Amino acid sequence: KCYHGKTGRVYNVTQHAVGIVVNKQVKGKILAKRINVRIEHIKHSKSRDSFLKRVKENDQKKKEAKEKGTWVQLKRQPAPPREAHFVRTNGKEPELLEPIPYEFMA
Amino acid sequence: GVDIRHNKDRKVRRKEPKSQDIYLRLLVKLYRFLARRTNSTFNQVVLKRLFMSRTNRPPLSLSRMIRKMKLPGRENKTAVVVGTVTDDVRVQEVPKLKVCALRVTSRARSRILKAGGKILTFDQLALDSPKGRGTVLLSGPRKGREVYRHFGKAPGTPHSHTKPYVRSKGRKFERARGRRASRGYKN
Amino acid sequence: AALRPLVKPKIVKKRTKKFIRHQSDRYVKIKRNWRKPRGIDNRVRRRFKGQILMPNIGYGSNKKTKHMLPSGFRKFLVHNVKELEVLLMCNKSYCAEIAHNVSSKNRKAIVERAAQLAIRVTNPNARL
Amino acid sequence: PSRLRKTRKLRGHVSHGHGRIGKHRKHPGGRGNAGGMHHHRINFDKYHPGYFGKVGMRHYHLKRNQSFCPTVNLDKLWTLVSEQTRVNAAKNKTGAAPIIDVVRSGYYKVLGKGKLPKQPVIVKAKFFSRRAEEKIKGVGGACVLVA
Amino acid sequence: AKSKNHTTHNQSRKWHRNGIKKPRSQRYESLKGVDPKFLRNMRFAKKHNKKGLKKMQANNAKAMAARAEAIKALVVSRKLHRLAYIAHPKLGRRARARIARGLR
Amino acid sequence: APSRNGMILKPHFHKDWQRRVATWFNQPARKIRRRKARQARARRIAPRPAAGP
RNA sequence: CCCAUACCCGGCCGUCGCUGGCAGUCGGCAGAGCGAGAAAGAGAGGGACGCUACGCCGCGACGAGUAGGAGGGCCGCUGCGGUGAGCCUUGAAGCCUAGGGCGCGGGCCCGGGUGGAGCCGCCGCAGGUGCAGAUCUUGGUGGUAGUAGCAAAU
RNA sequence: GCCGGGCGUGGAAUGCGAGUGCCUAGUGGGCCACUUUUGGUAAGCAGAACUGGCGCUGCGGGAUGAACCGAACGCCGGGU
């Protein structure tokens, strides 16, 4: 039960089960330990694929735009502060908000 | 108040030889100057090794330096070892070497010079090669001491092939319960 | 009209009183010499306000004026006339002090010898 | 030299380096190798596995002189004779092999650990290993038994 | 004469003094625990790797030659950058020589 | 109480060994007495060999 | 508006770090330099100080502490091998001290007094080597206190 | 599983030199508080979880104070 929800990597494949190397925290030290679990308790992790996908466009947009010379940003960047823009109030004017008065519910 | 930890701000390392040997301290005076006023990082390695304790500069066998000199990009460079060059009797042939060691055993000197070799000391090395150019810096097997067989994971631990401390070896000195599957268990 | 030192810097002392042992006043068996208190409950040991101070390295004197007499020199004990000729070049900075047990007939062989080498003597007219 | 020992620095510190809570008492765990199975069980099983129990046959009146058999490896077989013999053997064109009597040097059995220089020998020994013989023959020597 | 039974009060602080270090990562991890049938054969694949060595260097010699004949078949304002070109120590030497004639 | 790692030592000091400690401070005096007795014997049998038969 | 040992600026001490710098004191056999944002050559056809290098010097940052660990003691005691052409009846050791000072400190050096015969510095060596306590051991002395008390049997 | 070759915009932010091995003392009575929480009428009670404290720690404040609030300490001058 101490591995339900943990994620590891396969290192050995038998007929019905696989060997996994999982990190288990044991009182102030981590242990990369091996378990043999049957296939039913196993899923492919989709945590790595979004990296694998991102590698493709990085490898795509590198050979591309190289002969074009255009230096295309590759590294991800955190959500930047949003730009300056104009907000149009064409026609309508902003409607007023006022706190409603209290009234005992129960 | 500052939110730091002074737990390990004092780096533990040798800054001078613990020995009071004056000939060693003269060599240190020579290489403190060389390491400081040359950009040659070779001198900083030799200087750092002159401080080391006896167990940190182990002896270099004669066969081990014959062997580490038969490598291709070599056969002309000087062999530098900060420790000592013991003789190896299980080697038959000796090519002509150019050796610079702190200490060479009696039988190794007679065997090296017999082969038209040449033995240098570190005061001569500094004159011939101040920046250490054209040298091969060698080292003895540091974990060759018998002590390191006792180190590591304790015995009586699964797959911990570590030599125990026994006063004598025999059929009735730690061959029982912790070792046989017949007697309790084993690891 | 005495011998003047080379330089006369202003001696600054971080503290001038002695450090007295804790409770050295309350008892006679407890001499004045400093001992670091090591009791588990000791007030002085844990810097309570208004107690005896403990000697730190912070009270250390300025290295430039350490061991310097108020005159501006630094003492050097001598036992005979031969031990003066070593101060012949440390003239303007080190003064000589004749040892206690040197006889009175030999002191009047040192004070006038030191007057020739212009070596200042801290206790010239000791015995007389 | 007591002036370098630790007790010189512990003068003035009450507990003398043994703590205030857990005083330095006489024998808090028993004397000697006590409790090897009871309260020192972990230490004996973690650092001296195999300590408790009996294994093997007993030999009542053992005389070490009967099982005396010092061994020598082939790597240093040529160190028993002087170097003058080893160089006159290769210099010799007759093909006469020098004789290396190990039991005279102080060994009984010859083990084939090392590599041998290519020149024939005649090894006089009391015992041989299979590899030791196979290496001697490959060089061109001969294994001569003695008693 | 009872006492405290169990606690983990100070433990998390004790664990993080020397850090909770992840196990030593290392390429080429050991092959202990692998299926013996798979391992037994894998050792045979290494035992006979030298059998195809002459095929290797022969197909490798042409493979470097393949790309050998391949590549040989093919083979913010101007004012500030002007001053930065003069202020360059190496490639500005011939640029700051009119200044020698400027005061003259 | 065994510490972390060491040998299992069995010092045979459980008897009253301190009462039967033989010190060797007479060793140089014994070497002298032996030699003097050896030379005194050689003079007594002067022409005969010193070692014996 | 008031003030903490907090924060800022400055002084000083120490520790740590830079595994920093200094053998270049290179002088009529002379030429006085390497603070300079930019991989690399001031390349040939009569003159202060200093550098016990285990020394000296420069920058930074930092400093609580029981149990415990380590380092440094030109701190201290006693004896031993060396050494000081050491000290001493023209006064050693010891002890006293409203004297003069040094050291953060352990401690030490002078002056004065007393004393009457031995003693110390430095480099090593050795240890029965440093006390406030243990209802500690032995010896001595207080307060209590000129007090309780010196009243059984005429 | 092996060789051989080609690809460096080092592929989120921020911070920071890391790794590793010996030998090893003391400790193994704890206590308190915010929040969560068990028994109990309750407790300055008994028992846990998380973090921080006290213990090992002075200093300014709470008149007073092991633990609260501020803030952690070489020796000083000025400022705040």
Short mmCIF file of N, CA, C and O (backbone and C1' of nucleotides) in Angstrom, two decimals, chain G residues 69-107:
data_model
loop_
_atom_site.label_atom_id
_atom_site.label_comp_id
_atom_site.label_asym_id
_atom_site.label_seq_id
_atom_site.Cartn_x
_atom_site.Cartn_y
_atom_site.Cartn_z
P G G 69 33.99 15.05 25.20
"O5'" G G 69 34.44 15.38 23.72
"C5'" G G 69 34.14 14.48 22.67
"C4'" G G 69 34.33 15.11 21.32
"C3'" G G 69 35.65 15.82 21.11
"O3'" G G 69 36.73 14.95 20.87
"C1'" G G 69 33.91 17.16 20.31
P A G 70 38.16 15.29 21.49
"O5'" A G 70 38.72 16.42 20.53
"C5'" A G 70 38.94 16.15 19.16
"C4'" A G 70 39.14 17.42 18.38
"C3'" A G 70 40.33 18.27 18.77
"O3'" A G 70 41.56 17.79 18.27
"C1'" A G 70 38.45 19.64 18.52
P G G 71 42.92 18.09 19.05
"O5'" G G 71 43.24 19.60 18.67
"C5'" G G 71 43.39 19.99 17.31
"C4'" G G 71 43.34 21.48 17.16
"C3'" G G 71 44.40 22.26 17.90
"O3'" G G 71 45.65 22.26 17.24
"C1'" G G 71 42.31 23.28 18.23
P G G 72 47.01 22.25 18.08
"O5'" G G 72 47.12 23.74 18.62
"C5'" G G 72 47.09 24.83 17.72
"C4'" G G 72 46.96 26.14 18.45
"C3'" G G 72 47.91 26.32 19.62
"O3'" G G 72 49.21 26.67 19.22
"C1'" G G 72 45.75 26.95 20.28
P G G 73 50.43 26.37 20.21
"O5'" G G 73 50.31 27.52 21.29
"C5'" G G 73 50.70 27.30 22.63
"C4'" G G 73 50.03 28.28 23.55
"C3'" G G 73 50.46 28.20 24.99
"O3'" G G 73 51.69 28.86 25.23
"C1'" G G 73 48.13 28.22 24.92
P C G 74 53.04 28.00 25.28
"O5'" C G 74 54.02 28.89 26.15
"C5'" C G 74 54.88 29.83 25.53
"C4'" C G 74 54.74 31.19 26.15
"C3'" C G 74 53.51 31.97 25.73
"O3'" C G 74 53.10 32.81 26.81
"C1'" C G 74 55.44 33.15 25.08
P C G 75 51.55 32.99 27.16
"O5'" C G 75 51.08 31.52 27.55
"C5'" C G 75 51.67 30.83 28.64
"C4'" C G 75 50.79 30.88 29.86
"C3'" C G 75 51.34 30.22 31.10
"O3'" C G 75 52.27 31.03 31.78
"C1'" C G 75 49.11 29.56 30.80
P G G 76 53.63 30.39 32.35
"O5'" G G 76 53.14 29.51 33.58
"C5'" G G 76 52.52 30.13 34.69
"C4'" G G 76 51.90 29.13 35.62
"C3'" G G 76 52.80 28.01 36.10
"O3'" G G 76 53.69 28.41 37.13
"C1'" G G 76 50.73 27.12 35.47
P C G 77 55.11 27.70 37.28
"O5'" C G 77 54.77 26.30 37.96
"C5'" C G 77 54.17 26.25 39.24
"C4'" C G 77 53.94 24.84 39.69
"C3'" C G 77 55.15 23.93 39.67
"O3'" C G 77 55.99 24.11 40.79
"C1'" C G 77 53.30 22.81 38.73
P U G 78 57.58 24.10 40.61
"O5'" U G 78 57.95 22.56 40.56
"C5'" U G 78 57.81 21.74 41.71
"C4'" U G 78 57.90 20.28 41.36
"C3'" U G 78 59.17 19.85 40.66
"O3'" U G 78 60.25 19.64 41.55
"C1'" U G 78 57.32 18.96 39.52
P G G 79 61.72 20.13 41.15
"O5'" G G 79 62.27 19.00 40.19
"C5'" G G 79 62.82 17.81 40.72
"C4'" G G 79 62.71 16.66 39.76
"C3'" G G 79 63.70 16.63 38.62
"O3'" G G 79 64.98 16.18 39.01
"C1'" G G 79 61.57 16.16 37.79
P C G 80 66.29 16.73 38.26
"O5'" C G 80 66.27 16.00 36.86
"C5'" C G 80 66.48 14.61 36.77
"C4'" C G 80 66.37 14.13 35.36
"C3'" C G 80 67.32 14.77 34.37
"O3'" C G 80 68.62 14.23 34.40
"C1'" C G 80 65.15 14.72 33.46
P G G 81 69.86 15.12 33.93
"O5'" G G 81 69.76 15.12 32.34
"C5'" G G 81 70.13 13.98 31.59
"C4'" G G 81 69.92 14.20 30.11
"C3'" G G 81 70.76 15.27 29.46
"O3'" G G 81 72.06 14.80 29.14
"C1'" G G 81 68.52 15.50 28.77
P G G 82 73.27 15.83 28.99
"O5'" G G 82 72.85 16.73 27.75
"C5'" G G 82 73.24 18.09 27.68
"C4'" G G 82 72.53 18.80 26.56
"C3'" G G 82 72.86 20.27 26.40
"O3'" G G 82 74.06 20.48 25.68
"C1'" G G 82 70.53 19.99 26.34
P U G 83 75.18 21.45 26.27
"O5'" U G 83 74.54 22.90 26.14
"C5'" U G 83 74.21 23.43 24.87
"C4'" U G 83 73.22 24.56 24.97
"C3'" U G 83 73.65 25.76 25.79
"O3'" U G 83 74.50 26.64 25.08
"C1'" U G 83 71.47 25.15 26.40
P G G 84 75.53 27.55 25.89
"O5'" G G 84 74.62 28.66 26.56
"C5'" G G 84 74.13 29.75 25.80
"C4'" G G 84 73.21 30.62 26.61
"C3'" G G 84 73.84 31.41 27.74
"O3'" G G 84 74.42 32.62 27.29
"C1'" G G 84 71.80 30.42 28.45
P A G 85 76.01 32.78 27.22
"O5'" A G 85 76.53 32.11 28.56
"C5'" A G 85 77.75 31.40 28.57
"C4'" A G 85 78.61 31.76 29.75
"C3'" A G 85 78.77 33.26 29.99
"O3'" A G 85 79.06 33.47 31.37
"C1'" A G 85 80.86 32.34 29.42
P G G 86 77.89 33.80 32.42
"O5'" G G 86 76.58 33.95 31.53
"C5'" G G 86 75.56 32.98 31.61
"C4'" G G 86 74.23 33.59 31.99
"C3'" G G 86 74.12 34.07 33.42
"O3'" G G 86 74.61 35.39 33.61
"C1'" G G 86 72.31 32.67 32.93
P C G 87 75.28 35.81 35.00
"O5'" C G 87 74.08 35.76 36.04
"C5'" C G 87 73.02 36.69 35.96
"C4'" C G 87 72.01 36.46 37.05
"C3'" C G 87 72.54 36.51 38.46
"O3'" C G 87 72.71 37.83 38.94
"C1'" C G 87 71.17 34.62 38.22
P C G 88 74.01 38.19 39.79
"O5'" C G 88 73.77 37.47 41.19
"C5'" C G 88 72.64 37.79 41.98
"C4'" C G 88 72.51 36.86 43.16
"C3'" C G 88 73.75 36.67 44.00
"O3'" C G 88 74.00 37.74 44.89
"C1'" C G 88 72.77 34.58 43.58
P U G 89 75.50 38.15 45.23
"O5'" U G 89 75.48 38.42 46.79
"C5'" U G 89 75.09 37.39 47.70
"C4'" U G 89 75.25 37.83 49.13
"C3'" U G 89 76.68 37.92 49.63
"O3'" U G 89 76.74 38.92 50.64
"C1'" U G 89 75.53 36.35 50.92
P U G 90 77.64 40.22 50.46
"O5'" U G 90 76.84 41.11 49.42
"C5'" U G 90 75.60 41.71 49.78
"C4'" U G 90 75.15 42.71 48.74
"C3'" U G 90 74.82 42.12 47.37
"O3'" U G 90 73.80 42.90 46.75
"C1'" U G 90 76.55 43.69 47.15
P G G 91 72.26 42.70 47.14
"O5'" G G 91 72.15 41.16 47.50
"C5'" G G 91 71.89 40.20 46.49
"C4'" G G 91 71.19 38.99 47.04
"C3'" G G 91 69.74 39.21 47.42
"O3'" G G 91 69.02 38.00 47.23
"C1'" G G 91 70.94 38.57 49.33
P A G 92 67.64 38.01 46.43
"O5'" A G 92 67.46 36.50 45.97
"C5'" A G 92 68.11 36.02 44.81
"C4'" A G 92 67.92 34.54 44.66
"C3'" A G 92 66.53 34.02 44.99
"O3'" A G 92 65.63 34.16 43.91
"C1'" A G 92 68.12 32.72 46.11
P A G 93 64.08 34.44 44.20
"O5'" A G 93 63.58 33.13 44.92
"C5'" A G 93 63.44 31.92 44.20
"C4'" A G 93 63.03 30.79 45.11
"C3'" A G 93 61.71 30.97 45.83
"O3'" A G 93 60.60 30.63 45.02
"C1'" A G 93 63.35 30.30 47.37
P G G 94 59.35 31.61 44.92
"O5'" G G 94 58.73 31.59 46.39
"C5'" G G 94 58.24 30.39 46.94
"C4'" G G 94 58.10 30.49 48.43
"C3'" G G 94 57.17 31.58 48.93
"O3'" G G 94 55.81 31.19 48.87
"C1'" G G 94 59.18 31.67 50.14
P C G 95 54.74 32.13 48.13
"O5'" C G 95 54.28 33.13 49.27
"C5'" C G 95 53.88 32.63 50.53
"C4'" C G 95 54.16 33.62 51.63
"C3'" C G 95 53.58 35.01 51.45
"O3'" C G 95 52.20 35.07 51.77
"C1'" C G 95 55.82 35.18 52.16
P C G 96 51.23 36.05 50.95
"O5'" C G 96 51.60 37.49 51.51
"C5'" C G 96 51.39 37.80 52.87
"C4'" C G 96 51.80 39.21 53.18
"C3'" C G 96 51.26 40.27 52.24
"O3'" C G 96 49.93 40.64 52.54
"C1'" C G 96 53.56 40.62 52.58
P U G 97 48.89 40.88 51.34
"O5'" U G 97 49.26 42.33 50.82
"C5'" U G 97 49.37 43.41 51.73
"C4'" U G 97 50.13 44.56 51.13
"C3'" U G 97 49.65 45.03 49.77
"O3'" U G 97 48.51 45.86 49.85
"C1'" U G 97 52.01 44.87 49.78
P A G 98 47.43 45.85 48.67
"O5'" A G 98 47.27 47.38 48.30
"C5'" A G 98 46.93 48.35 49.28
"C4'" A G 98 46.68 49.68 48.63
"C3'" A G 98 47.93 50.37 48.08
"O3'" A G 98 47.64 50.97 46.83
"C1'" A G 98 46.80 51.81 49.57
P G G 99 48.19 50.30 45.48
"O5'" G G 99 49.32 51.30 44.97
"C5'" G G 99 50.28 51.82 45.88
"C4'" G G 99 51.58 52.12 45.18
"C3'" G G 99 51.58 51.91 43.68
"O3'" G G 99 51.02 52.99 42.96
"C1'" G G 99 53.47 50.88 44.60
P G G 100 50.23 52.71 41.60
"O5'" G G 100 51.38 52.39 40.55
"C5'" G G 100 52.32 53.37 40.19
"C4'" G G 100 53.27 52.86 39.14
"C3'" G G 100 52.62 52.33 37.87
"O3'" G G 100 52.28 53.36 36.97
"C1'" G G 100 54.24 50.79 38.63
P G G 101 50.94 53.26 36.11
"O5'" G G 101 51.34 52.31 34.90
"C5'" G G 101 50.71 51.05 34.72
"C4'" G G 101 51.64 50.08 34.04
"C3'" G G 101 50.99 49.03 33.17
"O3'" G G 101 50.62 49.52 31.90
"C1'" G G 101 52.57 48.00 34.56
P C G 102 49.39 48.85 31.12
"O5'" C G 102 49.95 47.45 30.65
"C5'" C G 102 51.04 47.38 29.75
"C4'" C G 102 51.39 45.96 29.42
"C3'" C G 102 50.24 45.09 28.96
"O3'" C G 102 49.89 45.29 27.61
"C1'" C G 102 51.45 43.94 30.60
P G G 103 48.34 45.37 27.20
"O5'" G G 103 47.88 43.85 27.22
"C5'" G G 103 48.54 42.91 26.40
"C4'" G G 103 48.17 41.50 26.77
"C3'" G G 103 46.70 41.20 26.92
"O3'" G G 103 46.03 41.07 25.68
"C1'" G G 103 47.87 40.22 28.69
P C G 104 44.72 41.94 25.40
"O5'" C G 104 43.65 41.33 26.40
"C5'" C G 104 42.50 42.08 26.75
"C4'" C G 104 41.34 41.17 27.04
"C3'" C G 104 41.56 40.15 28.14
"O3'" C G 104 41.33 40.70 29.42
"C1'" C G 104 40.60 39.10 26.25
P G G 105 42.43 40.57 30.56
"O5'" G G 105 42.45 39.02 30.91
"C5'" G G 105 41.35 38.42 31.57
"C4'" G G 105 41.35 36.93 31.37
"C3'" G G 105 42.49 36.18 32.02
"O3'" G G 105 42.22 35.91 33.38
"C1'" G G 105 42.23 35.46 29.79
P G G 106 43.42 35.81 34.44
"O5'" G G 106 43.90 34.31 34.33
"C5'" G G 106 43.00 33.23 34.50
"C4'" G G 106 43.59 31.95 33.98
"C3'" G G 106 44.95 31.60 34.55
"O3'" G G 106 44.84 30.88 35.75
"C1'" G G 106 44.99 31.43 32.19
P G G 107 45.67 31.33 37.05
"O5'" G G 107 47.18 31.15 36.61
"C5'" G G 107 48.14 32.13 36.97
"C4'" G G 107 48.88 32.61 35.76
"C3'" G G 107 50.09 33.47 36.03
"O3'" G G 107 51.23 32.73 36.40
"C1'" G G 107 48.80 34.49 34.37
#
